[PDB]
């Protein structure tokens, strides 16, 4: 049961919560980063205050704040008021919200995932088709089977190499 109390908090691999540079040249970070940093700020503040020694009243508040922070990291908005980064009244995303909801990992990236080799277009009626037939635009089928055609084209003299074949398609 003591494991239900947390003394060592883990931190998710930085790739899973990064601050990459967008095309505009600006960088963009996950809310997890600002949550984790918030904890560190409070933790080291407390470590110093404790190591130095100072009125309990202060320490009490500080320890409480470290609690609230951990709570925001694990499940923001669950306790108290949602933690909000300065500027917008937007609650930050906690690990729970990453795993919970339709936008959560399960109902968004595990039970259902976007797939390659897949296209979309407006549909029309094909009375001439047979029941086991459909009408697939040629250019769609080009992309859809692109690798298969790269091979077939290579079998032919339509292309010198697969790369130049694809560049022909470009």
């Amino acid at each position: 049961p003591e494991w239900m109390i947390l003394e060592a908090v883990p931190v998710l691999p930085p790739d899973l919560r990064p601050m990459v540079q967008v095309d505009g040249g600006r960088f963009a970070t996950s809310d997890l980063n600002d949550l984790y940093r918030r904890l560190i700020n409070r933790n080291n503040r407390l470590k110093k205050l404790l190591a130095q020694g100072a009125p309990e009243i202060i320490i009490r508040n500080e320890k409480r704040m470290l609690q609230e922070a951990v709570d925001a990291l694990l499940d923001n908005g669950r306790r108290g008021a949602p933690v909000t980064n300065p500027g917008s009244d937007r609650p930050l995303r906690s690990l729970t919200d990453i795993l919970s909801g339709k936008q959560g990992r399960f109902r968004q990236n595990l039970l259902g995932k976007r797939v390659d080799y897949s296209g979309r277009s407006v549909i029309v009626v094909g009375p001439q088709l047979k029941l086991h037939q459909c009408g697939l635009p040629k250019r769609m089928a080009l992309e859809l089977f692109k690798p298969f055609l790269l091979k077939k084209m290579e079998e032919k003299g339509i292309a010198p190499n697969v790369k130049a074949a694809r560049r022909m398609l470009e």
């Binding site: 202060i58 300065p86 937007r90 790369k163």
Partner: protein
Amino acid sequence: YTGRGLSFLDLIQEGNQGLIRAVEKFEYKRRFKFSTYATWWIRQAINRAIADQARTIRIPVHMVETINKLSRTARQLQQELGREPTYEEIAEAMGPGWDAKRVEETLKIAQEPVSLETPIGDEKDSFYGDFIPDEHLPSPVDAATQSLLSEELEKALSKLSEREAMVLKLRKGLIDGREHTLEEVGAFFGVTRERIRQIENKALRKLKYHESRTRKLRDFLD
């Protein structure tokens, strides 16, 4: 001191922190009431904290201070000019060593990252990271081409003897990633650098002839 990127309570913890140092240094011989000498460390601590804990990217306080005076001098212009300052106006208003380039430069450093979880559309069903690609990781086309290149490049080395190829492997760093100098390659084959150098040239040229019948590897150069 609120509304500067930190909450009341965070700031308070900082002001109390400094207050303990102030109490440790306060002298009643001066005869000034505690409030007088205390405020100094109470304001310094909170103001320093705001400059230490308000940026996802740690930026020195002195830099923050420059940026602050940039906005101060700028707004002065904005309200006087009745319009809107530029890199070059503020630059001169700031003083010497201040140019428009420096303004824009400082603004570039001041640029702050934005949240990937930012809402897209009025339907909160989309986020920024959804519309941001992966540039780092092997893209199946890139990895495919590298597999093809190394295969064909080897097929070109199969058009050389293992000595010629191996020499090229070490020299170009295909043997073990690390490219080995001619003196090292001559240490491997027990051969004078000149002979190693010349057979490497002979090997490259032999590849060129074979290529002049194929040019398959040029495609990978693209």
